[PDB]
Amino acid sequence: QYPIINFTTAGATVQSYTNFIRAVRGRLTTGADVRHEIPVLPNRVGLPINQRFILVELSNHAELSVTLALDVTNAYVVGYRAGNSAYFFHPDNQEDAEAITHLFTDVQNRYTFAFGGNYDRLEQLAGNLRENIELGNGPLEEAISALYYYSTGGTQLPTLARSFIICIQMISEAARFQYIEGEMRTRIRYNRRSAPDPSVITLENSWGRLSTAIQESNQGAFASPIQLQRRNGSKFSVYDVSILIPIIALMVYRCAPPPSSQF
Ligand SMILES: Nc1nc2nc(C(=O)N[C@@H](Cc3ccc(O)cc3)C(=O)O)cnc2c(=O)[nH]1
Numbered sequence: 001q002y003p004i005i006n007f008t009t010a011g012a013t014v015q016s017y018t019n020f021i022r023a024v025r026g027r028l029t030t031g032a033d034v035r036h037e038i039p040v041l042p043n044r045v046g047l048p049i050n051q052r053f054i055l056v057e058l059s060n061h062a063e064l065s066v067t068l069a070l071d072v073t074n075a076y077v078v079g080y081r082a083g084n085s086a087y088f089f090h091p092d093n094q095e096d097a098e099a100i101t102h103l104f105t106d107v108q109n110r111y112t113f114a115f116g117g118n119y120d121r122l123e124q125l126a127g128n129l130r131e132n133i134e135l136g137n138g139p140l141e142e143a144i145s146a147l148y149y150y151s152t153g154g155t156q157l158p159t160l161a162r163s164f165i166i167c168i169q170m171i172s173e174a175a176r177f178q179y180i181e182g183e184m185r186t187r188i189r190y191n192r193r194s195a196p197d198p199s200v201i202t203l204e205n206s207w208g209r210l211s212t213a214i215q216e217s218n219q220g221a222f223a224s225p226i227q228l229q230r231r232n233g234s235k236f237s238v239y240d241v242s243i244l245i246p247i248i249a250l251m252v253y254r255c256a257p258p259p260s261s262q263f
């Protein structure tokens with residue numbers, strides 16, 4: 001029922017990863033909502049359940065597969081399937097809890113984690129912050145295996161949390177930001193794993209605020225500047241949507257777009 005996008009870390013290249021992220025974005029957004037050349041994800045309000053999720057099937061060189069479920073309203077990884085078991089993060093509300101009952105319905109064993117899936121909680125469980133977790137094709141390859149082996153006792157909870165952190169950034173954050181996609185492309189091109197620099201972290205942390213600022217902007221101009229960080233940690237002030245067009249690929253729906261003003 002829900003659309004499936006396939007990616008493998010086995011012999012992954014810049015092009016195969018680029019194709020993957022493009023395909024994810026195409027299934028996340030409908031094309032209905034584009035503001036200042038930036039697509040907006042579907043509004044949660046009134047969105048039919050048959051349109052709520054996409055599936056990302058990850059394979060690796062170890063010949064293992066896991067399937068991540070992503071909420072189209074926010075690109076959030078809500079859970080995953082590995083073989084005969086599915087695992088869902090603790091839902092943040094009642095209707096998100098109802099929504100996940102529509103996923104992996106044929107699976108033998110259904111589990112809801114007692115913990116939520118936000119970075120704060122996952123970092124706590126991993127025993128490491130995002131700034132100290134390596135990203136790249138190698139980490140993703142290993143993350144797929146770790147997710148796969150969780151149900152049989154092979155994967156410690158900190159490793160599982162770390163693996164989620166890897167998946168979320170290389171899939172969801174890359175889909176949200178061309179900039180983060182670009183950083184992942186670089187790691188793949190050279191087969192060199194590295195932890196995300198402050199430009200990556202601050203973009204991830206600011207996605208909600210950037211989405212709202214763009215959507216509330218006066219003809220693209222922010223009422224309040226947003227402070228980001230560069231690769232070297234130095235401050236970068238954002239005053240306008242214009243500078244974000246090459247950086248942000250998708251926004252979360254925050255408000256209705258204002259009417260055009262006919263001059
Ligand atoms: N499973 C899953 N989890 C996710 N979790 C986050 C996440 O935790 N974002 C943070 C950003 C933030 C962090 C710290 C701050 O001080 C401020 C903002 C937030 O909204 O709280 C983002 N994306 C996903 C995602 O796609 N899938």
Ligand SMILES: Nc1nc2nc(C(=O)N[C@@H](Cc3ccc(O)cc3)C(=O)O)cnc2c(=O)[nH]1
Pocket residue numbers: 071074076078089090091092093096116117118204205207208252
């Ligand atoms: N399906 C689903 N969605 C969820 N979405 C959030 C969440 O943080 N939502 C934000 C949107 C947002 C997302 C990522 C960010 O980095 C920043 C903002 C909000 O409601 O404003 C937390 N949990 C869940 C969850 O369990 N299940």
